[PDB]
Write a protein that binds this ligand. Structure first.
Ligand SMILES: Nc1nc2c(ncn2[C@@H]2O[C@H](COP(=O)(O)OP(=O)(O)O)[C@@H](O)[C@H]2O)c(=O)[nH]1
Ligand SMILES: Nc1nc2c(ncn2[C@@H]2O[C@H](COP(=O)(O)OP(=O)(O)O)[C@@H](O)[C@H]2O)c(=O)[nH]1
Ligand SMILES: [Ca+2]
Ligand SMILES: [Ca+2]
Ligand SMILES: [Ca+2]
Lengths: 326, 326
């Protein structure tokens, strides 16, 4: 009755909604349910901005599962203003690095106050979730700092520099040469409380169809997490993030391009690799029409579009079935 | 050429406007400036709230002189939203009695980030004033903490408790039994950069008609400040904050009664005292019709209402005339 999903970004929050819908959790619950859902959440995008600690992936899961996301825009709070961001721009600090809405900042004020008072991020999340009540256990992949940076050629002096992923995404992406990722702090981090337990005891471990390099990937750089994934008796089912068939055939993933990986279901599959060898996957699900073949990994094409909680629920069901878990 | 004024918040900023209008400074500038205005600003109400440092008196002066104060509000940004505050409330956090505005939060966020990075308050203030361009030098009375505390009878248990001025002023509105004030940190606080020099090199020092107990008084408890005022070659001219029979906005009547001082123009003058003896004053201006007399103190009744910058400008000149300053 126990599911563990590794998540990051808007895509990860959407996948958890599918999981909740399938198992009657959170907003989809009718009576109190038979299953518990644990999310291991990326902290690679977390940063200190304007003296406050911002954790996007944990916040997006928490807001999404708590029913706080504006349905029209698809991100942020309902009835959101950006007045504090406006005054910051007048002050001269750069505030486009993250949405930084007024309602959003309240979360940041509360979290930063707890962190300064000695509460670890996992407990900070528990405290916020008492209000949001997402219907899932949102575990930060670590309580220690592990921030995704991008190494660029700085155009002001030609030097290699690491830039926080969020600054790279708004300002430098596609505008200067970019050489690699750095996981600043990862080597000094331990897996967050209950993360290795959640991976160890699960009936199944699901990799949401999030960005492989910068959403799932950074979770894997946290010491101990990869080991828990390679050892657990639970089947490990991955979902491909590559959806073909778009107008003009789509665009390659920019973060995959940094590490030189093609934007195909086959390449992302090899990226995570086979548990039978040195990799992470037992199963790899791809969208209708797509193909992959990887020595040791069971691949199945099924509809992989998170159109709505009901479509996402079907996708989760295809994961359980391919694992052989009920 | 050089004016130094000691100020509180709304009263202090309004008086500073009169000085600027008289001397063509700031928003009143109309050609090359011939005088420089320095404000020594109360830091007694400064507090850490929701993890950010609030400097009310410094901000009011800065907002007012910078044209960012909605006239109807009297303090705070114009077109101000309280969304973040509403969210803070949704989260169940304390203190819930103290409203932080969305536009106002940006000031606090920038100040807090800089103070935590090792910047002193004087440097933070100049940094903030580069945007606002107040047309005056806003000197925090100290860069060290010097916070006004209040001894009350707590109405929930009948026990004596000390509380920060913000709780006394904002939460209870001075309507709880109040026994004394404490200037916690004043003896340990060094006079802020340029504050002693501003008092020393001034042609005239003006005590603005701000709260005497909780606005001007707390400045005078900073050991260096009091010494400079009785030491400086400049005449020291004070303005009574009490208009006999004319209740003025604020709680100067409540704060005077705590220290056992009568609410009359003569009484506040006596509180500040005469430089000829143990005091600070050379001159004391009271409203037309009021009668006062302090041995060693030149007293003159003049129109003392800050209805608009021009009336205040007159009030400034009445100071200069009574001093004998051009
Ligand atoms: N398979 C699949 N992937 C999706 C779908 N919607 C979004 N994605 C993936 O979700 C990823 C979004 O990155 P994510 O880790 O969630 O961070 P985000 O940009 O904040 O959403 C993209 O790489 C997409 O390929 C979907 O319906 N199906
Ligand atoms: N003489 C005089 N005093 C005034 C006038 N308007 C307000 N005040 C005084 O200004 C004081 C507030 O100044 P201050 O302490 O700087 O304001 P706060 O910091 O916002 O409380 C009040 O206690 C009033 O007595 C006026 O027109 N004339
Ligand atoms: Ca299509
Ligand atoms: Ca004040
Ligand atoms: Ca000190």
């Amino acid at each position: 009755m126990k599911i563990t999903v590794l998540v990051g970004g808007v895509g990860g929050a959407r996948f958890l909604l599918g999981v909740q819908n399938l198992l009657g959790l959170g907003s989809f619950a009718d009576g109190p349910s038979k299953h518990e859902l644990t999310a291991v959440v990326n902290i690679g995008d977390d940063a200190w901005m304007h003296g406050v600690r911002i954790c996007p992936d944990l916040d997006t899961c928490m807001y999404t599962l708590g029913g706080g996301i504006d349905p029209d825009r698809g991100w942020g709070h309902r009835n959101e203003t950006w007045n504090a961001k406006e005054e910051l721009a007048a002050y001269g600090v750069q505030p486009d690095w993250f949405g930084l809405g007024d309602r959003d900042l309240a979360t940041h004020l509360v979290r930063s106050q707890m962190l300064r008072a000695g509460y670890p991020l996992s407990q900070v999340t528990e405290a916020l979730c008492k209000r949001w009540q997402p219907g899932a256990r949102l575990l930060p992949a670590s309580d220690e700092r592990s921030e995704t940076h991008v190494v660029i050629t700085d155009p002001t002096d030609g030097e290699r520099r690491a830039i926080h992923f969020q600054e790279w995404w708004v300002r430098y992406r596609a505008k200067v040469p970019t050489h690699s990722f750095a996981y600043v702090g990862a080597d000094q981090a331990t897996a967050g409380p209950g993360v290795v337990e959640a991976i160890g005891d699960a009936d199944i471990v699901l990799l949401a169809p999030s960005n492989p390099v910068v959403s799932i990937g950074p979770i894997l750089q946290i010491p101990g997490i990869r080991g828990a994934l390679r050892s657990t008796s639970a089947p490990v089912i991955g979902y491909s993030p590559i959806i073909a068939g778009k107008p003009l055939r789509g665009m390659a993933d920019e973060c995959l391009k940094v590490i030189g990986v093609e934007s195909t279901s086959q390449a992302v599959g090899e990226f995570f690799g086979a548990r039978a060898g040195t990799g992470l996957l037992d199963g790899w699900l791809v969208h209708e029409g797509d193909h992959a073949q990887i020595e040791g990994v069971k691949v199945k094409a099924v509809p992989l579009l998170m159109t709505d909680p009901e479509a996402t629920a079907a996708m989760v069901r295809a994961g359980l079935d391919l694992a052989g878990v009920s």
